[PDB]
Design a protein around this ligand. Structure first.
Ligand SMILES: NC(=O)C1=CN([C@@H]2O[C@H](COP(=O)(O)OP(=O)(O)OC[C@H]3O[C@@H](n4cnc5c(N)ncnc54)[C@H](O)[C@@H]3O)[C@@H](O)[C@H]2O)C=CC1
Ligand SMILES: NC(=O)C1=CN([C@@H]2O[C@H](COP(=O)(O)OP(=O)(O)OC[C@H]3O[C@@H](n4cnc5c(N)ncnc54)[C@H](O)[C@@H]3O)[C@@H](O)[C@H]2O)C=CC1
Ligand SMILES: NC(=O)C1=CN([C@@H]2O[C@H](COP(=O)(O)OP(=O)(O)OC[C@H]3O[C@@H](n4cnc5c(N)ncnc54)[C@H](O)[C@@H]3O)[C@@H](O)[C@H]2O)C=CC1
Ligand SMILES: NC(=O)C1=CN([C@@H]2O[C@H](COP(=O)(O)OP(=O)(O)OC[C@H]3O[C@@H](n4cnc5c(N)ncnc54)[C@H](O)[C@@H]3O)[C@@H](O)[C@H]2O)C=CC1
Ligand SMILES: NC(=O)C1=CN([C@@H]2O[C@H](COP(=O)(O)OP(=O)(O)OC[C@H]3O[C@@H](n4cnc5c(N)ncnc54)[C@H](O)[C@@H]3O)[C@@H](O)[C@H]2O)C=CC1
Ligand SMILES: NC(=O)C1=CN([C@@H]2O[C@H](COP(=O)(O)OP(=O)(O)OC[C@H]3O[C@@H](n4cnc5c(N)ncnc54)[C@H](O)[C@@H]3O)[C@@H](O)[C@H]2O)C=CC1
Ligand SMILES: Nc1nc2c(ncn2[C@@H]2O[C@H](COP(=O)(O)OP(=O)(O)OP(=O)(O)O)[C@@H](O)[C@H]2O)c(=O)[nH]1
Ligand SMILES: Nc1nc2c(ncn2[C@@H]2O[C@H](COP(=O)(O)OP(=O)(O)OP(=O)(O)O)[C@@H](O)[C@H]2O)c(=O)[nH]1
Ligand SMILES: Nc1nc2c(ncn2[C@@H]2O[C@H](COP(=O)(O)OP(=O)(O)OP(=O)(O)O)[C@@H](O)[C@H]2O)c(=O)[nH]1
Ligand SMILES: Nc1nc2c(ncn2[C@@H]2O[C@H](COP(=O)(O)OP(=O)(O)OP(=O)(O)O)[C@@H](O)[C@H]2O)c(=O)[nH]1
Lengths: 496, 496, 125, 496
């Protein structure tokens, strides 16, 4: 077990090393080889550390009257591409070392999936099992009056997001503050945080986002004859059978969505139990019982088959659970053919060899969980240009679309003036929904998948470019660094 | 040896404990005893930690072309009394733990000597023996474009100051930046740093300040019959003989100034040698040789008497050298009667007992070295109201003063119309200087001593109030906390 | 905006020291800013230059603005450019002619036959 | 006749050349001689040109309804010492070449008399004999909404002042605008212009300032035995007899004030006539007739003695008239012993030799007319700290002063308990005024002269330092450059 800071740190170190040779060859500015190679070895030392790390302390007054101090952190990994964005964690485990760590990932997520954001992360040492509906407000509404006074929250400088122990309810309290004290003289005030309640400028699909992100991740590689063959796998969701490592906000949806396209959810689990039914499991019923019973350990149409799901038959596995689900202490017990990581750091770097040595493909946790990030990047636009997506232009396409068919029909009337008479070219039931069920929702559902598409190809292009083969994690971090480098390389970073 | 963070931390912990009882008695707002006592025990937990701690990283490009990263810190101990102020250290030893530490002291210095400043401190990990006349500019001029973008430099939010390895030359580069990029639209831009070169808005006496601060420190207690008797000491500088622990920017002046009032400088030393001449030593000659020879180890009218000055005869000792000159490992070897500390943390808390047990008085390093701070507080005013001190009103008093004597003379002409005839009431040679040698300089030299005066009495009043007797350090930290508490107690600190 | 410089004199670095200064001046006097004024490339001013400008205005003054990087155009595509910033002017010239050579009201009066597929042209450089 | 731009330009060119050698010797930073000498020859190329020159054009709509364009200029000679300050001229002669010129002078005036201002100047092409009480408002109130939108007016960036065709009435219209549109959110808004009407934040003595400036100029050199002897002149105003070249806002006062100290105003003149009465002339009567008759050509107690006053007996001459009163075409016709220039460029550089060759002293027009500048620098402080000078502290000194005498009296009661009994030490009639006639006025009258004093000595020190002897103009420009250089030399001018 490494430090999750150190464990991620080591990743791009590898990635930096690999691109290193290729990159000097690719740069063109006429310089000395050693110079324009020690150059990139120097820029790549700039990208590694975080550029700002803020520590705080709060005079919070409790409900009983007493006071207490709240150690709270904030780190912006790089002003590389403003505005920085990252979640806000509430947990006593939060330490400045971990905040630096995540800030790194958020900077490379955004690089992967091409969203113009830097990377941030912020924690506070609070166990929300202690405070009330009210003290949390007195805290969050204070943790923003601090950051804002020091330029670490603002629609153009930095944008918080939800994290564990940080629901919608919280992010409302933030915006309700920054848009009332400091950002008041700004048109873009409510663009300060994402994941707001849909009433106050949210996005439909902020919850199911990450899950439906995981989905379009797999669908961009399972449709690749260049890997499915090499993986010894048959292309198609309708062909394969998968499993799930829990029922997080991810699992509940990642399951259901992939469930919707014929891939058979073999088994599932819990943070405190196991479930197994090797012949397909119903999402919705679970979505009932896990909320009807507070646990599916007792879902009747399955079995509590104690044991790691990670050791159970599956053509696709989703470690949709918390940190470090895998070590090489079970790498000989994968039972899978393709693993697509759900949360950050589920696998040690160690076992990653063995999976390659056992010849499978473990899609990296970089961009899979980054489905949510893009959705935030959309809510940060919805709020930014002050208009629901496409409300301006919804009835327009509705008009034109079946004001276009009416031409095809009319144009067929030439050849078929009397053969069959009138020919009512009409939509279908489905294509009627995409007309009548028009909503910003479907824009997201659309824009989301396409970002994942163009992204996931940028990786398969990378793996081919460096013969990494089934080394996606590296290639990903390679593909991220390749991008972040371009920005510095041209910025003439020296502002003096 | 403790951590200098922890070692200072422990100080006011004692101080907080002592005032604790007296303070609840002194508060009047009608509340429950346990409540309005757990109150103060809670406010006193707020004051301890720092409210902001910033960490940085710089893409500095060297002279040869290469890049490198510059870890740089900044800490504002409390927004208690804006604007915060503290020096900027250059040294590889700088670590976020020490930056928090000093930030505490600067907050209690200012509390002692009644200057409305919070407390800050900032380091960078640089050994200036590495860089050039130019890279330092490329660094400092960058370490301000960062802080300024995040609200940690600004004439109303925070004000840097010189520290070790940070001469005038540096502080110019800062102001030359903040007053050219961000603060440009501000009238108060050049109030951003103090210790600027006198040309660019400095103060005459910025160098000799700290020394002449040490002086008026002692003169406020050595003139106290309540202690000089108890110390078994004869009131008067013309009576006592002292020593000096080095020739810092402090010693060169603290010596010379106290030299000017009949107190006999017995011996002196160096960071790399000893000197002794138990019958008075000439400042100026040393101020020659230490600059003529780069060392006084060879000053002819003295001797290189190797051994700790701290173990040499003296009625007053000045540990005007770097951190932790004393432990109890020589507490039985004080040889002194009154010790007045020059730099921060020269003595372990341990030995402080023994000095009390050996019945001497060790004046705390809190306010002695804080002579310089006030002088900075003046340069921050000179720059603030855009006018040399008293240039507006210099010739006015010059007029009135000897337009007043001319009345006394003329009024004597009544009683003495013919007894002695004309009676030229005139000034003296000295009082002529205070007229003709009028300068902002003399204002400082004046305002400085009076701040030290009113301060040093606030301590002797405190020691009497709590029967601390010869416990000045405590009483000082007690007197500081007493003040800083008042501000929070009334602020209704909750901004939400 | 011009400056009196013959870029055949200075280096990869002095030009930076110049351009990055010619913006700290204008910006202090309200002549650069995404809502007040927007530079663009000209002769002896490639992409490389316009990067140095934005890299400055979006780091000293416009830092507290969401629209900072809107200060100049023709930036390198990495830093917020547009694909087709180079070939633009040319493909501009094209759609110019195509809007008049398809005009029977002029092609006739010009004694000209409407259509690109019909005509033969030349180029001055 | 040279271009007044070129003619001033040439001045400091000489001055730059002279200091050039001395200055490299004086700098200490260890560098190569040729390097740290080409250094100063390079800094001295920076100081020469203006750093900003703005040209404008106004859609002014006339009273009749028509439109017209108003070419208007503005030039800030150097951001060297913010805020820049200069007058606003209305005249059709105004051209960008002349605006650059004056901006230079205002930068060296301020350098001479030690007021922390840069230098500016602004004209518009208007002949105010054309427009009305109202169009001028529509113009001025527009020429500020333009400059303000581009950072050329503002209490910390730039400060206009009155010039020819620009009375109080105008400067009110400016402040009434900048303090109502843009500077509204600033506490320092009304500090934007000086010379405002006394009601709206002016200074008593804004008119008579320049004149009473000319006065304390001469009084600082005519009291110099080092020159009065060398000039073959007898020290004292009560000894000498002078003349005046007109009755400008300068002459009306420069005459009267020097009139008040026994120097005999021999003759005077007009822009359209001559006057002569070689036996002393009354200011006030002229101040009547020139306003009773609109001309003194007919003042009964003198004669209309046509001919250049510059060719008439005088121990002191004041060319208090407009540009280029002298050439060498009358240099053999000086008739004077000391000439003290009133307005800018009254003498060609050519004749200056001849005066030296005829062995007289022509005090430069740099600082003589700069008496007004300092007074503006005070109104820019009065407005800045929002309090009449000394109103806070007037009754305090009044108390202490004759609460001090009452001690001297009482203390004499010891020696003289019965010799003469009660001894009423009282003020005099005069010293009573300085008590009862206490006013911000007298502060100015005081602070003014002292600035001129400390200034005029900085010149006599300079002339001695470079053996310039009776070369004051040069020495002045030398003394200015010496100062302006210090600021750049230390600023590390490179902000990148
Ligand atoms: N030639 C290649 O390998 C690639 C080309 N592209 C081109 O760029 C376009 C896509 O770029 P968009 O971002 O959608 O539009 P854009 O105009 O904002 O492109 C900005 C560029 O910066 C990079 N970038 C994006 N987000 C970043 C971040 N957070 N940090 C650092 N770098 C980042 C992207 O590679 C992108 O090419 C496509 O049209 C495609 O033609 C994109 C990716 C790879
Ligand atoms: N919620 C969001 O918007 C995002 C969440 N994530 C990450 O996703 C992960 C969890 O997703 P959440 O959204 O937090 O959903 P959640 O909080 O609702 O997830 C908890 C689920 O994981 C299960 N679980 C926990 N430990 C397990 C273990 N060792 N084995 C099997 N099941 C286990 C629980 O029983 C439960 O079903 C975390 O790593 C979180 O940081 C990442 C990005 C966004
Ligand atoms: N009754 C007492 O024990 C004391 C009374 N005083 C009174 O206050 C006046 C002196 O205060 P000034 O500061 O010169 O004027 P001021 O009007 O600014 O006083 C502010 C008050 O806040 C406190 N203070 C000053 N600097 C501080 C800092 N950096 N942090 C926290 N608290 C700070 C001081 O005790 C002062 O009384 C004197 O006239 C005296 O009458 C001052 C000290 C002790
Ligand atoms: N310079 C300033 O404005 C301020 C300085 N200080 C503190 O004062 C102390 C030193 O004063 P500086 O101004 O830095 O002067 P400096 O840097 O010129 O002081 C160095 C002097 O101390 C002597 N020295 C060093 N270690 C010694 C040891 N163990 N025994 C005897 N002599 C020793 C050296 O030989 C030398 O004479 C430091 O603690 C510094 O932080 C504190 C506040 C302001
Ligand atoms: N050693 C010398 O030759 C001189 C020394 N001084 C010292 O400086 C003090 C007077 O300076 P103040 O301005 O009253 O206070 P200050 O603290 O503002 O001094 C600023 C310094 O910058 C220079 N300066 C002033 N106005 C300037 C301008 N507009 N442009 C460029 N440089 C300018 C002055 O020479 C002054 O020494 C006196 O106390 C005197 O001791 C002043 C003049 C000459
Ligand atoms: N008024 C002010 O605040 C300042 C005025 N000045 C300068 O002072 C000069 C004039 O002083 P103003 O204040 O404008 O007063 P003004 O406008 O009232 O001066 C005009 C006076 O000069 C006389 N005059 C004009 N040409 C003459 C000539 N060739 N020979 C003899 N007398 C002549 C007129 O008859 C009249 O008495 C100008 O050069 C102006 O720029 C400079 C700084 C400030
Ligand atoms: N489908 C589904 N939605 C849920 C569930 N629990 C909460 N939700 C919320 O209900 C919303 C339903 O989304 P809809 O807009 O009605 O339908 P959709 O977006 O086309 O697809 P689904 O989200 O899967 O229903 C989601 O956005 C979730 O935020 C669940 O168990 N299943
Ligand atoms: N006196 C003194 N001043 C020094 C010495 N070295 C440098 N200086 C500087 O020279 C200045 C001399 O100060 P002055 O204004 O001339 O005289 P003063 O302020 O009345 O008292 P001193 O500073 O002790 O001379 C001080 O401000 C120091 O900054 C030194 O060895 N002795
Ligand atoms: N076509 C073309 N492109 C060039 C040439 N030289 C540089 N380029 C660049 O290459 C890019 C090619 O554009 P593409 O996006 O690949 O293709 P296109 O925009 O559909 O049309 P073209 O620009 O003509 O290729 C252009 O935007 C130019 O900036 C050239 O000689 N021909
Ligand atoms: N003395 C004098 N003042 C005039 C004259 N014309 C206008 N004034 C104004 O009247 C004011 C008179 O100033 P006061 O404050 O009353 O007296 P003072 O300042 O001590 O000296 P004077 O200005 O010479 O009277 C001056 O400030 C001028 O602005 C004049 O001819 N003589």
């Amino acid at each position: 077990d490494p430090n999750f800071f150190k464990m991620v740190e080591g990743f791009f170190d590898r990635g930096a090393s690999i691109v290193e040779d290729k990159l000097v060859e690719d740069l063109k500015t006429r310089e000395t080889e050693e110079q324009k190679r020690n150059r990139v070895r120097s820029i790549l030392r700039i990208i590694k550390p975080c550029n700002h790390v803020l520590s705080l302390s709060f005079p919070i007054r409790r409900d009983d009257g007493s006071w207490e101090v709240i150690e709270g952190y904030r780190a912006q990994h790089s002003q590389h591409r403003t505005p920085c964005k990252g979640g806000i964690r509430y947990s006593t485990d939060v330490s400045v070392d971990e905040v630096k760590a995540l800030a790194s990932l958020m900077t490379y997520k955004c690089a992967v999936v091409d969203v113009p954001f830097g990377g941030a992360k912020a924690g506070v040492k609070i166990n929300p099992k202690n405070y009330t509906d009210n003290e949390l407000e007195k805290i969050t509404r204070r943790f923003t009056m601090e950051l804002a006074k020091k330029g670490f929250i603002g629609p153009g400088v930095d944008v918080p997001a939800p994290d564990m122990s940080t629901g919608e309810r919280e992010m409302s309290w933030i915006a309700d503050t920054y848009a009332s004290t400091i950002g008041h003289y700004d048109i873009n005030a409510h663009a300060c945080v994402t994941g707001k309640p849909i009433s106050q400028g949210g996005i439909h699909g902020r919850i199911s986002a990450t899950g439906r992100g995981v989905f379009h991740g797999i669908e961009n590689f399972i449709n690749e004859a260049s890997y499915m063959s090499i993986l010894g796998m048959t292309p198609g969701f309708g062909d394969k059978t998968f499993v799930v490592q829990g029922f997080g906000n991810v699992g509940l949806h990642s399951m259901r969505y992939l469930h919707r396209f014929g891939a058979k959810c073999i088994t599932v689990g819990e943070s405190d139990g196991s479930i197994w039914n090797p012949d397909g499991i119903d999402p919705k019923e679970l979505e009932d019982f896990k909320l009807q019973h507070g646990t599916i350990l007792g879902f009747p149409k399955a079995k509590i088959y104690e044991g790691s799901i990670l050791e159970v038959d599956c053509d696709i596995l989703i470690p949709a659970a918390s940190e470090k689900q895998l070590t090489k202490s079970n790498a000989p017990r994968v039972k899978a053919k393709i693993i697509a990581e759900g949360a950050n750091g589920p696998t040690t770097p160690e076992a990653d060899k063995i999976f390659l040595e056992r010849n499978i493909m473990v899609i990296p946790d970089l961009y899979l969980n980054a489905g949510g990030v893009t959705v935030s990047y959309f809510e940060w636009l919805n709020n930014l240009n002050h208009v629901s997506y496409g409300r301006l232009t919804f009835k327009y396409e509705r008009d034109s679309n079946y004001h276009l068919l009416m031409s095809v029909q009319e144009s067929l009337e030439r050849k078929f003036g009397k053969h069959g008479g009138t020919i009512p070219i009409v939509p279908t039931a489905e294509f009627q929904d995409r007309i009548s069920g028009a909503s910003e929702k479907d824009i997201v559902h659309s824009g989301l998948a396409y970002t994942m598409e163009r992204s996931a190809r940028q990786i398969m292009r990378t793996a081919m470019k460096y013969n990494l083969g089934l080394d996606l994690r590296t290639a990903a971090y390679v593909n991220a660094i390749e991008k972040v480098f371009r920005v510095y390389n041209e910025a003439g970073v020296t502002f003096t």
